[PDB]
């Protein structure tokens, strides 16, 4: 029985023009869709259907095989709120040594979609070289990219993950849309095989996965701190921290390090050193509070060569996070391609940290972005974005600024 779903009250279905596509991407979309139809994942529809949603084709990682990407941003805004289902967002996830991202989207296609709602998923596939009108389809199954899919597939996913979660209590698995984020502190080799065990478990359920994507949230921000061998570790950490806090205490701890004492030797804790340790922990340890009910906003500025700066906030001037991205040496300069990668990363961070995608303000012209962005986009999701409003300067040769 299809889980009944409704649009938000007083809201109609999405109508969004389908953007023009390259012959190559079209030829891929046609072939992809022809097969989705044979499998009954989608069905042709008649002229009686007003609604439309935009579609494109991307390629993930090194894969030369095309993936279809539908833009549900409108539909998702207009869809009912599933929050009843949502399991508070894990804070520990961002702490983990390694976090891998799996695309579970294939799972959704085994679940039928409510017959009443299907009309709203309508999309148009342009023909080759626009020789004939485009063909319009809809979704008979939970589509990838629609916020309803994960909410409705929740119970089923929980069942699939249960055994592995029981078997690995120290591994955190968190889902956002079509992606499964698996964190852990395990040695990278151990972690990797844990992912592979997972992938083989999901495969037992018929759920197929593409090779994972490795993240190291450890390296996103600069971080707080934590036998004779151990006392050397501390002293080394304080000396390092000394270049930061001039008040860090050293000599008292150094006084205990004089000797031939072996690694095994256990040094006693003197009342002289403990003062330096308690005061050090004291210099170790505010910020701005994050409100789950509000929205995350991300502003991006271009710093002029390879450089881009960003801030993430809710109320202006109060920033939850600020950072910078820079173009690699030896990389061609393409501002859209670079900006596209920055947006995807900032989003990945927001997803991992607050479990939410920020609304973007992009330092670039609307036209440029909307033309190019799909070329460089590797993500299964798209955020909301807004372009700074200024007109670009148009100057002919014979004109003087």
From Swiss-Prot:
Result when mutating residue 70 to T: Confers resistance to d4C, didanosine, stavudine and zalcitabine
Effect of residue 64 to G: Confers resistance to didanosine, zalcitabine and zidovudine
Variant or mutagenesis effect after changing residue 177 to T: Confers resistance to abacavir, didanosine, emtricitabine, lamivudine and zalcitabine
Site feature location: Essential for RT p66/p51 heterodimerization: 372, 385
Effect caused by changing residue 183 to S: Confers resistance to efavirenz and nevirapine
Domain of life of the organism encoding this protein: Viruses
Effect of residue 177 to V: Confers resistance to lamivudine
Outcome, altering residue 183 to C: Confers resistance to efavirenz and nevirapine
Annotated consequence of substituting residue 65 to R: Confers resistance to zidovudine
Outcome reported for the amino acid change (mutating residue 219 to T): Confers resistance to atevirdine and zidovudine
Outcome recorded upon mutating residue 128 to M: Confers resistance to delavirdine, efavirenz and nevirapine
Annotated effect of mutating residue 70 to M: Confers resistance to stavudine and zalcitabine
Outcome of swapping residue 94 to P: Confers resistance to TMC125
Effect caused by changing residue 131 to K: Confers resistance to emivirine
The protein, known as: p51 RT
Gene name linked to the record: gag-pol
Residues of the full protein shown: 593 to 1017 of 1435
């Amino acid at each position: 029985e299809t889980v009944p779903v409704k649009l938000k009250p007083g809201m109609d279905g999405p109508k969004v023009k389908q953007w023009p596509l390259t012959e190559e991407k079209i030829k891929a979309l046609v072939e992809i869709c022809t097969e989705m139809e044979k499998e009954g994942k989608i069905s042709k529809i008649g002229p009686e259907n007003p609604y439309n949603t935009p579609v494109f084709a991307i390629k993930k990682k090194d894969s030369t095989k095309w993936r279809k990407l539908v833009d549900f941003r409108e539909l998702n805004k207009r869809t009912q709120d599933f929050w009843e289902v949502q399991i508070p967002h894990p804070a520990g996830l961002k702490k983990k040594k390694s976090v891998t991202v799996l695309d579970v989207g294939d799972a959704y296609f085994s679940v039928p979609l409510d017959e009443d709602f299907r009309k709203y998923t309508a999309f148009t596939i342009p023909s080759i070289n626009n020789e004939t009108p485009g063909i319009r389809y809809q979704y008979n199954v939970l589509p990838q990219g629609w916020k309803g899919s994960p909410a409705i597939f929740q119970s089923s996913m929980t069942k699939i993950l249960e055994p592995f979660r029981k078997q690995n209590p120290d591994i955190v698995i968190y889902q956002y849309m079509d992606d499964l984020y698996v964190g852990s502190d395990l040695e990278i080799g151990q972690h990797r095989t844990k992912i592979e065990e997972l992938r083989q478990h999901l495969l037992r359920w018929g759920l197929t996965t593409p090779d994972g994507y490795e993240l190291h949230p450890d390296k996103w921000t600069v971080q707080p701190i934590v036998t004779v061998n151990d006392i050397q570790k501390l002293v080394g950490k304080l000396n390092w921290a000394s270049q930061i806090y001039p008040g860090i205490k050293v000599r008292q701890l150094s006084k205990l390090l004089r000797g031939t004492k072996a690694l095994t030797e256990v040094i006693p804790l003197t009342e002289e050193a403990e003062l330096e340790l308690a005061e050090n922990r004291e210099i170790l340890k505010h910020g701005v509070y994050y409100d789950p009910s509000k929205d995350l906003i991300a502003e991006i500025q271009k710093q002029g060569q390879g450089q881009w700066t960003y801030q993430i906030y809710q109320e202006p001037f109060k920033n939850l996070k600020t950072g910078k991205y820079a173009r690699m040496r030896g990389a061609h300069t393409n501002d859209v391609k670079q900006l596209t990668e920055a947006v995807q990363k900032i989003t990945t961070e927001s997803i991992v940290i607050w479990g939410k995608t920020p609304k973007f303000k992009l330092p670039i012209q609307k036209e440029t972005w909307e033309t190019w962005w799909t070329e460089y986009w590797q993500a299964t999701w798209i955020p909301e974005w807004e372009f700074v409003n200024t007109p670009p300067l148009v100057k002919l040769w014979y004109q003087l600024e």
